[PDB]
């Protein structure tokens, strides 16, 4: 929408959070170094009223060794948010990635998953659950008065619609999920809000498996307040109709919905990326703008069911999507972006994606104009 509109500095553009302030908060995922960068700081002050850490609140960053807690980086994000009136989300208490391996070792230092004795397996389950509770207790006791929204567990349902068979699940079963939520509620009180977080929440059979899991846990009294939808999506997929059905489905259980990691990749999956930002054709940015136009129109339609929409980054100069931006080369060394075309080699994670409404020079993209207007 409206490529007529100019590529002005985002520091001079109408504020994104103020455009949506009655519908939902507008968030950005950050690294602490960006709080020391003048442009990123001004971007956060101008456009965003919610914040989340893309990495430094993950388990391995918080307690990389048992009893060694590193809150210095998380503290910096919390302090910045409080100074600028931003909501904070905690990402994430429990996850099968970026998770220190000391969690899953028995008292003799061996992997708990290897244990065959059922009496010892049960001892390992209780030990793991105690470590889990202490990790959550220490974090929530420090942050309960500052951080309102909590991703308690992340990606606990596999894409095959079964519970993901992580060490958490192999060792403790489903109880690691119940213990995580119960611990957060106990040490954090009734005022913090507890989410189950996942990607591809729109996609069956994962969607209904997540639905069934949360419905059953709440029937058993496990405190779950909402669903965190990562929304790492594409220009075409998933369809707005399927996003809408997903949001409505979870809202019917009385759950809040938060969009916690929104980015609109320029590519399919697996991605065949352009090697640089400059190689991306203008038309892709128009396609992305029209997708963003439909997407935020749908979010507004559903604003009574969505409290927050967070982008997984600030501007196109920095996005975890670049780690997936594989560049394919044919035999003559030219770039291949057609998903079915011949190619000879791939350079994994060497290309550039362009997923946000702000460009890498901090000027607004057509996608920005598409979502700042009221059409
Ligand atoms: Cl309004
Ligand atoms: Cl990143
Ligand atoms: Zn308005
Ligand atoms: Zn309104
Ligand atoms: Zn603001
Ligand atoms: Zn995550
Ligand atoms: Zn990053
Ligand atoms: Zn629009
Ligand atoms: Zn307006």
UniProtKB/Swiss-Prot annotation:
Q: Which residues form the GH10 domain?
A: 10-374
Can you name this protein?
Endo-1,4-beta-xylanase
GO BP term, example: xylan catabolic process
What reaction is this protein's catalytic activity?
Endohydrolysis of (1->4)-beta-D-xylosidic linkages in xylans
Which InterPro entries would you find in this protein's record? GH10, GH10_AS, GH10_dom, Glycoside_hydrolase_SF
Q: Which UniProt keywords apply?
A: Carbohydrate metabolism, Glycosidase, Hydrolase, Polysaccharide degradation, Secreted, Signal, Xylan degradation
Give any Gene Ontology cellular component. extracellular region
GO molecular function annotation: endo-1,4-beta-xylanase activity
Enumerate the PANTHER family for this protein.
Answer: ENDO-1,4-BETA-XYLANASE A, GLYCOSYL HYDROLASE
As for family, the record states: Belongs to the glycosyl hydrolase 10 (cellulase F) family.
One Pfam entry name: Glyco_hydro_10
Taxonomic source organism: Geobacillus stearothermophilus
Compartment(s) of residence: Secreted
Q: In which pathway does it act?
A: Glycan degradation; xylan degradation
Query: What does its record list under induction?
Result: By xylose.
Q: Which Gene3D superfamilies match?
A: Glycosidases
Q: Which SMART domains match?
A: Glyco_10 (SM00633)
């Amino acid at each position: 929408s409206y490529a007529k509109k100019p590529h002005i500095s985002a520091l001079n553009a109408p504020q994104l959070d103020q455009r949506y302030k009655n519908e939902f908060t507008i968030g950005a995922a950050v690294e602490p170094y960006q709080l020391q960068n003048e442009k990123d700081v001004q971007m956060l002050k101008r456009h965003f009223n919610s914040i989340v850490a893309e990495n430094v609140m993950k388990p391995i960053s918080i307690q990389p060794e048992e009893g060694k807690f590193n809150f210095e980086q998380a503290d910096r994000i919390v302090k910045f948010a409080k100074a600028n009136g931003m909501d904070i989300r905690f990402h994430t208490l429990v996850w099968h990635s970026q998770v220190p391996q000391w969690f899953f070792l028995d008292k003799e230092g061996k992997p708990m998953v290897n244990e065959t004795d059922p009496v010892k397996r049960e001892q390992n389950k209780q030990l793991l659950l105690k470590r889990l509770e202490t990790h959550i207790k220490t974090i929530v006791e420090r942050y309960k008065d500052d951080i309102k929204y909590w991703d308690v567990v992340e990606e606990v349902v596999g894409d095959d619609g079964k519970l993901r068979n992580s060490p958490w699940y192999q060792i403790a079963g489903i109880d690691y999920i119940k213990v995580a939520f119960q611990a957060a509620r106990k040490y954090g009180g009734d005022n913090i809000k507890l989410y189950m977080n996942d990607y591809n929440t729109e996609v069956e059979p994962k969607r209904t498996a997540l639905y069934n899991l949360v419905k059953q846990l709440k029937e058993e009294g496990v405190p779950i307040d909402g669903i965190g939808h990562q929304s790492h999506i594409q220009i075409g997929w998933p369809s707005e109709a399927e996003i809408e059905k997903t949001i409505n489905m979870f809202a019917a259980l009385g759950l809040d919905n938060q969009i916690t990691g929104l980015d609109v990749s320029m590519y399919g999956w697996p991605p065949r990326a352009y090697p640089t930002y400059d190689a991306i054709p203008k038309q892709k940015f128009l396609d992305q703008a029209a997708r963003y136009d439909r997407l935020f129109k749908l979010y507004e339609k559903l604003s009574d069911k969505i409290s927050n929409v967070t982008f997984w980054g600030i501007a196109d100069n920095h996005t975890w999507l670049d780690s997936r931006a594989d560049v394919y080369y044919d035999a003559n060394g030219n770039v291949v972006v057609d998903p079915n075309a011949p190619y000879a080699k791939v350079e994994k994670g060497k290309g550039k994606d362009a997923p946000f409404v702000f460009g890498p020079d901090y000027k607004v993209k057509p996608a920005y104009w598409a979502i700042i207007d009221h059409k």
